[PDB]
Structure formats: C-alpha cells, structure tokens
Design a protein around this motif. Sequence first.
Motif, PDB file in Angstrom:
ATOM      1  N   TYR A 146       0.870  -1.221   0.133  1.00 60.15           N
ATOM      2  CA  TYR A 146      -0.047   0.081  -0.120  1.00 60.15           C
ATOM      3  C   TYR A 146       0.709   1.147  -0.102  1.00 60.15           C
ATOM      4  CZ  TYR A 146       1.016   0.476   5.128  1.00 60.15           C
ATOM      5  OH  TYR A 146       1.559   0.368   6.177  1.00 60.15           O
ATOM      6  N   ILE A 147       0.190   2.416  -0.371  1.00 56.39           N
ATOM      7  CA  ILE A 147       0.791   3.847  -0.183  1.00 56.39           C
ATOM      8  C   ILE A 147       0.000   4.695   0.878  1.00 56.39           C
ATOM      9  CG2 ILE A 147       1.254   5.672  -1.875  1.00 56.39           C
ATOM     10  CD1 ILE A 147       1.293   3.639  -4.295  1.00 56.39           C
ATOM     11  N   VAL A 148       0.664   5.587   1.589  1.00 58.65           N
ATOM     12  CA  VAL A 148      -0.041   6.183   2.356  1.00 58.65           C
ATOM     13  C   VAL A 148      -0.134   7.600   1.634  1.00 58.65           C
ATOM     14  CG1 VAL A 148      -0.142   7.727   4.465  1.00 58.65           C
ATOM     15  CG2 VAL A 148       0.490   4.975   4.485  1.00 58.65           C
ATOM     16  N   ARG A 149      -1.386   8.222   1.355  1.00 62.82           N
ATOM     17  CA  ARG A 149      -1.491   9.466   0.677  1.00 62.82           C
ATOM     18  C   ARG A 149      -2.344  10.514   1.663  1.00 62.82           C
ATOM     19  NH1 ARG A 149      -5.837   8.544  -3.959  1.00 62.82           N
ATOM     20  NH2 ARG A 149      -7.868   8.415  -2.587  1.00 62.82           N
ATOM     21  N   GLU A 150      -1.813  11.786   1.575  1.00 62.41           N
ATOM     22  CA  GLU A 150      -2.854  12.749   2.291  1.00 62.41           C
ATOM     23  C   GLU A 150      -4.116  12.792   1.842  1.00 62.41           C
ATOM     24  OE1 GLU A 150      -2.608  17.457   1.942  1.00 62.41           O
ATOM     25  OE2 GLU A 150      -0.948  16.629   3.390  1.00 62.41           O
ATOM     26  N   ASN A 151      -5.188  12.916   3.057  1.00 66.78           N
ATOM     27  CA  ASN A 151      -6.575  13.062   2.802  1.00 66.78           C
ATOM     28  C   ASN A 151      -7.176  14.034   3.835  1.00 66.78           C
ATOM     29  OD1 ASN A 151      -9.231  13.064   2.534  1.00 66.78           O
ATOM     30  ND2 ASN A 151      -9.263  11.013   1.262  1.00 66.78           N
TER      31      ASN A 151
END
Length: 133
Positions: free
Chosen positions: A47-52
């Motif tokens: 997985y990738i962690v992205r800003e939200n």
Amino acid sequence: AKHYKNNPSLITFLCKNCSVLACSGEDIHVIEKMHHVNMTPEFKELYIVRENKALQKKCADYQINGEIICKCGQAWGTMMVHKGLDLPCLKIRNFVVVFKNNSTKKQYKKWVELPITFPNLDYSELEHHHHHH
Ligand SMILES: [Zn+2]
C-alpha cells in the motif's frame, strides 16, 4: 457473532479494483473491538499512504495521518497511529473476500457482516504486542 467461525485462515482479501491479493484473514487484528488492521511488515509493501484532509484527525486513542491505497490507486483504508505505532486500518467495502475450498467470492459493507471472528488487541495491549511479536 456467536455462530461465526473463529478461523481467519479461511479467507483472503483481494483489492476490489485490481484483484491483487491484499492479505490473508490470518494477518488481521481487530483493535479495541472496532478497527480491523493488518500490522504485518509484508502488508506495508502493498500500500501507499497519501494525504487526505477529509479523513485526517486527532482522536483520543489514535491519530489518523493519511489514507491507505492499493498500488493500483484503489482506496483501502486509513493510516491510524497509536503512541507512535502504525495501525493500517482496512475498510471491508474496498475488498472482495474469497473463502477457501469453496472459493466463493463475496462483498460486504461492514466488518460485522463477515461471519468470521478475528483476534482482538485492546489499545492497552499494542505497545506490548509490538515490543515482543
Ligand atoms: Zn488494487
């Protein structure tokens, strides 16, 4: 829940969009009877962690620091952090669940709808768990 199977190895989770294997049911823990997470090192390579900013917030027992997504782009859940420890939280609505030997595929909207019981760790057990296991 009383008639559920306490055998998470019976299921596998596939990304609902690209069908890649996300993890075995054996790699899931429920945290404080609510959050379903996968804390294994192998899962972090998927997985990738992205800003939200719609999902990020500070809570009493954890902070949400981002959104977890599949390498294909499909959202999978949120990145919770409790006392500096990562809790990759999965929302069941983002996966296809496959049951073994019968290999039947299913979709659910809430974790309680999946008739499988997983091991629980209360927040108070997380530091010990990470220190030893
Ligand atoms: Zn995917």
